Design an enzyme around this catalytic site. Structure first.
Site, PDB file in Angstrom:
ATOM      1  N   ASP A 139      -1.507  11.154  22.807  1.00 49.80           N
ATOM      2  CA  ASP A 139      -1.455   9.919  22.049  1.00 49.80           C
ATOM      3  C   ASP A 139      -0.372   9.011  22.626  1.00 49.80           C
ATOM      4  O   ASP A 139       0.232   9.301  23.662  1.00 49.80           O
ATOM      5  CB  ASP A 139      -1.219  10.225  20.570  1.00 49.80           C
ATOM      6  CG  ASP A 139      -1.827   9.182  19.657  1.00 49.80           C
ATOM      7  OD1 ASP A 139      -2.409   8.206  20.174  1.00 49.80           O
ATOM      8  OD2 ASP A 139      -1.726   9.338  18.423  1.00 49.80           O
ATOM      9  N   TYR A 173       4.925   2.156 -10.956  1.00 49.75           N
ATOM     10  CA  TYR A 173       4.709   1.306 -12.119  1.00 49.75           C
ATOM     11  C   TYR A 173       4.124  -0.056 -11.776  1.00 49.75           C
ATOM     12  O   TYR A 173       3.821  -0.828 -12.690  1.00 49.75           O
ATOM     13  CB  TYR A 173       6.025   1.098 -12.876  1.00 49.75           C
ATOM     14  CG  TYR A 173       6.782   2.375 -13.133  1.00 49.75           C
ATOM     15  CD1 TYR A 173       6.288   3.332 -14.004  1.00 49.75           C
ATOM     16  CD2 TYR A 173       7.991   2.625 -12.505  1.00 49.75           C
ATOM     17  CE1 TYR A 173       6.975   4.501 -14.243  1.00 49.75           C
ATOM     18  CE2 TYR A 173       8.686   3.790 -12.737  1.00 49.75           C
ATOM     19  CZ  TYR A 173       8.174   4.724 -13.607  1.00 49.75           C
ATOM     20  OH  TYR A 173       8.864   5.888 -13.841  1.00 49.75           O
TER      21      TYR A 173
END
EC number: 5.6.2.2
Lengths: 751, 751
Positions: free
Chosen positions: B100, B359
């Site tokens: 890679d 949240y």
């Protein structure tokens, strides 16, 4: 000179007692407070930077010193008089924290404990206050004002008397950041009536000591029962006059935070997995249900976070996914949930040498999972709801007790929780004896359950272990193996103790100065999944080794010189299904406690299947009837579905709930009965043209016969001598054993 | 005594030159090498720990010192003679790295550069080698031996001469961890023929200097054209004799790593977003296509990682998602992709005060996205394929140039890319002039495109800015506003410069010792999205300030004393669609380059719509014909689908590709033509019973009329005076403007 402190205009002056200090959990909370405190003309009567300041919560603690400095608090003085309290620069301190576990309960609990330890009178006289924002808002179409609830129980009671929530949207606000712009304005319109004062009652004296500091063995007794939510009477008293007892906050909010931290490390005894691992298993079943096509670990980690509400970060998620697929001698899983495709780690690094989640692929062990965790009774389990959305189950009830069959360890951050896997053969013998009425020890075992007689043995598993398991006294010890080469003065270690990593073992010998005096070179030529370690001795050290370790009866000199022995200490501390900690004296007690849960799940699995199967027979019979009469009930001559439905009704076709009958899902029997027959004729109108063919109808007719035959079989299964579903349990044990044997013949690859 | 070093048995001895040192990238690579090196009897001819050692890649570098120590390398000596090279403890060093970008190219490129800098003769004589594992393996059903490719070009050539890949499974191995247990054994069976030697050629000397060290301004020219993959002739020469030129490795593997790093921080000029942000937009369209129901940021982050192949971690993913939804004066997005539900940050902290992703909920700005990024031409874009799976597009071509309308920062190096948003009205005038043939400046602008005349102005955007934008020389400056209170000696700052955070601005004044001599207290009473800062002066410092900052003509004394002025420096460096870096002198040049891409996309959008619409008319006409003849063609009297299909064929019903016609997806016109008419009769057999009703047929008949009318409209749109689709482009600009205006009337809330 305090960071993130915004002083009030009147703070410290003549109107100091009218000022209030807002203590925010973080920067996001401070931004919300700044928005509310600066509404200006839009909120003429609301609070402003007049008589209101902000401080960030972030003796040795730096953030606590800032609060003391801005408030003008003095440690030695006791604020028992009003004149002394007037010296403070602010009238009161209000804590603005999230309503989650890492909110009120931990940050607010510590703040209350800090004030209780130094200035108890301030809590008594109402100096410490709390901002109680709405927790749940319910929005209905056509209405701009939602219904707001400050507790989970209040919403539950309100939802009971609604009989319909299709037009209502329920949103959870468990953090201050969750409030939208219009919601923040609404809260600060009524800022006065959402400020609650803390009161110091008699029970809070010992509760503060239990949850903060002090000796242990008293906090342990508190954490062995679970969280009791505040009753309706208690909440109403809190709302009637806005005073929150300190004891009530500690035994609900603080205890829940303590239990949540433990539940992240200690598994449930029913399935032997924690909540984080249960999300992965639940997410793994969903992800690979359609097709068991391999996915990258990071890709599968995204699925779990998106579907199972995993919000603890990908660092812990990827690590837990990798651990769930590791299979090597000494791994925590003898029966991994996933099939590891790639390098997932080895015994040498203790699984820490796993590949990157980017290049590492994962796949569900379908054969083992579908037998150990049947999908039929996965609908019947209690489930965890997070922000009102269904998440992983509260617990799984596998065919065999996984809490006994695996290896479990936990750092000493609470209960120790060390578990050593028991033998598969021993576990099968116990469960088969309990279930099979023809077993010779069936009657003996059942009588032993109620008297704790442990007639059958449970021994440590020695699979993937080329060593010795010896019992001395009340403990088992695992021994490694070694070979001594007299000619070349080499000791070759061919096996380590049961769960000892190779690299860490080498460091243990190297850090021992006494043992390094006899050796000069250690070479690890071991293969993967096999130990072969070269120990080079000094030219004349072999005889000196024997005379320095004395060759005790339990441990040989070489087994003493080389640390090739370890004790299998077990700490059987688990999490109860309803919450809390249960301590087990022996491995049998865990098995005995798991038996009733699996026994009752089979009973209610057949009851629901009997109800579902009865409905499906009715629906398929109607569909078959339509196919025979479709030619002369040619619906092409009717205008629309409403006219077509009327024609079907006039012919005696029953209205049915098409979706409910096809996929009952998480529907109880009473819920199923009251909704299945109250539907429409979509089961006819959605029939494809290919379903009217002769072969298609014949297969459907044969399906009805199978269900009718299966319906009578289920009735027989309910009336079984030991208990309902006993024969079903027996045949599922055999299926699990075949899957385990097949997975062991391969390297848990299965293909 | 080197960490993570496993010496060979013969290393440093008589057979030292026969030994090879394997340099592994990390622990996972070391585990793979240990597995291969210890196959034993299963691989009798393969390498073992005889004549082979392992070292971990992890003068000042500690890891490089270990390699020198184990190899016995001497810095001063030049290994120009075979006798001198025999002094080394190993015959050669073999690098085992991932295939890679953060593998070979960075780790292997640095290793080659390190050897080239100190011991060039070692590379010349073949001391440095590389392990070249297969990159792609193709598995066919019924065959146990896959077809292995070491370059993606080889696989592409092989796939061209394959009839179909329906029975072939293609797997990518871009990291060493990706290889499964059976694949590792196969590679070490032929370990000798996967070891490649690096050769030093003439072109490598300057390439090593360009890519490593050598200051800069020579690497920039290299990175302005994109990576050229190795041709078939070059790969065949590499495979014929296993020698890899150092120049070829640097120009492909190392260059691609360099370009990938830049592409992570510098956006494409067509859509003004990086690859990471393009994945979020592409994932956002997919996630919220079915229903624009709000989701938590962490939940949506899991969706992007699972579907758009985002593997850089949730820390950067959540941060980028939050930045894509921030809307405040000075935010990077004037037109956010998402609707932010909650606290996403404020101008005071520069967006760093956002709430936690747990949240914080997110929602797609459907009205703006559906108009700025049409869904109909997203099928026509080139797409990024990651491990053979489709990912986010290579680039988007929006209706208006987003690279011009937003704010770009690039905080961490990367050509100092910076963009200041241009006025929306100015951009609309330019694009409308280019597209509308009735525009008075249509002919003038077209002449200006080919001569770079920039007749129309492009001015900086002043939206959400209560300040002054003044031009002096060749630069724009943004000025803040202030109010001076003579009575109370207070200077109130009512506005800051364009993108200046409030908190950072306060620290800038406080860290200025000379400025703090005139002030004693700075109070930030500013609201959200508005600046109001209290600056308390010394009792007699107002006059001393005027005489100490000289009252520059461009900058006021207070605007000098308080840093209320900033320069809008812009460096217009972007990423080309085909790869590389393009430098733009002015903002209009970016608009001129984006115009052809949007112009041609409209042309090919109508070409494919014309082809798809023609097929859908045929299919719907056949379906309508069947509905009329359904009663006479009573399929209930035929056995199976095979008999029913034969009956339909005998009646002249055309066989059609049902899925392709309904959802063409990423199908070209030529691909569409050769597959649409070749299919089964599922479009009839899958018809539901509700589709045969009179109202259902009437709606289908009216749909055919609309398509036939639309078909003639599309033909007219192709023959348009300026260019095909000009009127479609013109009306889509109006839709975008209405969405932008609607989003600005609200706070980008659209509610």
């Amino acid at each position: 000179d305090v960071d993130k402190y915004t002083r009030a205009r009147n703070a410290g002056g003549k109107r100091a007692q009218d000022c209030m200090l807002l203590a925010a959990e973080g920067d996001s909370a401070l931004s919300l407070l700044r928005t509310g405190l600066t509404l200006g003309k839009s909120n003429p009567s609301g609070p402003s930077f007049d008589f209101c300041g902000m401080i960030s919560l972030g003796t040795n603690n730096k953030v606590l010193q800032g609060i003391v400095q801005v408030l003008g608090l003095d440690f030695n003085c006791h604020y028992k008089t009003q004149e002394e309290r007037a010296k403070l620069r602010y009238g009161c301190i209000v804590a603005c924290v999230d309503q989650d576990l890492d909110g009120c309960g931990k940050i607010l609990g510590l703040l209350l404990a800090y004030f209780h330890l130094f200035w108890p009178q301030l809590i008594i006289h109402g100096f410490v206050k709390r901002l109680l924002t709405p927790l749940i808002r319910v929005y209905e179409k056509g209405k701009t004002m939602p219904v707001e609830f400050y507790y989970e129980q209040e919403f539950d009671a309100w939802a009971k008397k609604q009989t319909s929530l299709v037009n209502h949207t329920v949103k959870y606000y468990k953090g201050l950041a969750a409030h939208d712009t219009h919601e923040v304005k609404s809260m600060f319109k009524h800022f006065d009536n959402m400020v609650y004062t803390f009161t110091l009652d008699d029970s809070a004296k010992e509760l503060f000591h239990i949850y903060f500091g002090g000796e242990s063995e008293l906090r342990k007794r508190e954490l062995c029962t679970g969280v009791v939510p505040l009753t309706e009477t208690q909440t109403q008293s809190i709302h009637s006059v806005r005073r929150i007892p300190c004891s009530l906050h500690l035994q609900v909010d603080t205890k829940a935070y303590k239990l949540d931290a433990i539940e992240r490390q200690i598994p449930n005894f029913l399935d032997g997995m924690t909540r984080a691992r249960r999300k992965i298993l639940a997410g793994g079943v969903k992800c690979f249900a359609s097709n068991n096509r391999e996915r990258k670990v990071f890709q599968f980690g995204g699925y779990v976070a998106d579907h199972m509400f995993y919000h603890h970060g990908d660092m812990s998620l990827n690590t837990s996914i990798i651990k769930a697929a590791q299979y090597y001698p000494g791994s925590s899983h003898l029966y991994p949930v996933f099939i590891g495709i790639g390098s997932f780690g080895s015994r040498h690094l203790g699984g820490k040498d796993a590949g990157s989640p980017r290049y590492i692929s994962v796949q569900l062990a379908s054969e083992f999972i579908k037998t150990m965790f049947p999908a039929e009774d996965s609908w019947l389990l209690p489930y965890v709801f997070e922000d009102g959305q269904r998440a992983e189950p509260e617990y799984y009830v596998p065919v065999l007790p996984l809490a006994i069959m695996e290896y479990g360890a936990n750092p000493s951050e609470g209960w120790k929780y060390t578990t050593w896997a028991r033998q598969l053969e021993d576990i099968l013998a116990l469960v088969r004896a309990y279930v099979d009425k023809d077993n010779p020890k069936h009657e003996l075992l059942h009588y032993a359950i109620k008297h704790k007689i442990t007639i059958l043995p449970l021994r440590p598993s020695n699979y993937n272990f080329k060593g010795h398991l010896k019992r001395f006294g009340q403990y088992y010890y695992s021994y490694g193996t070694y070979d001594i080469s007299e000619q070349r003065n080499i000791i070759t270690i061919t096996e380590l103790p049961l769960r000892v990593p190779t690299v860490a073992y080498i460091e243990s010998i190297k850090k021992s100065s006494n043992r390094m005096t006899f050796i000069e070179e250690i070479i690890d030529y071991s293969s993967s999944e096999t130990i072969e370690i070269l120990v080079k001795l000094k030219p004349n050290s072999l005889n000196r080794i024997v005379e320095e370790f004395k060759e005790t009866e339990e441990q040989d000199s070489i087994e003493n010189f080389l640390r090739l022995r370890n004790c299998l200490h077990s700490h059987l501390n688990f999490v109860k299904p309803k919450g809390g900690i249960i301590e087990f004296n022996s491995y049998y007690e865990i098995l005995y406690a798991w038996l009733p849960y699996r026994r009752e799940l089979y009973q209610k699995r057949l009851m629901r299947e009997h109800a579902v199967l009865k409905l499906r027979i009715i629906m398929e019979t109607a569909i078959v009837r339509y196919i025979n009469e479709s030619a002369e009930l040619n619906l092409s001559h009717y205008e629309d579905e409403k006219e077509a439905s009327r024609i079907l009704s006039e012919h005696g076709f029953p209205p049915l709930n098409h979706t409910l009958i096809i996929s009952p899902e998480f529907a109880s029997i009473e819920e199923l009965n009251q909704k299945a027959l109250q539907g429409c004729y979509t089961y006819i109108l959605s029939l494809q043209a290919r379903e009217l063919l002769i072969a298609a109808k014949t297969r459907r007719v044969e399906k009805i016969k199978k269900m009718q035959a299966r319906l009578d079989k289920v009735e027989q299964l309910l009336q079984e001598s030991p208990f309902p579903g006993a024969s079903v349990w027996l045949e599922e044990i055999d299926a699990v054993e075949k899957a385990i044997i097949k997975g062991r013949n391969t390297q848990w690859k299965f293909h």
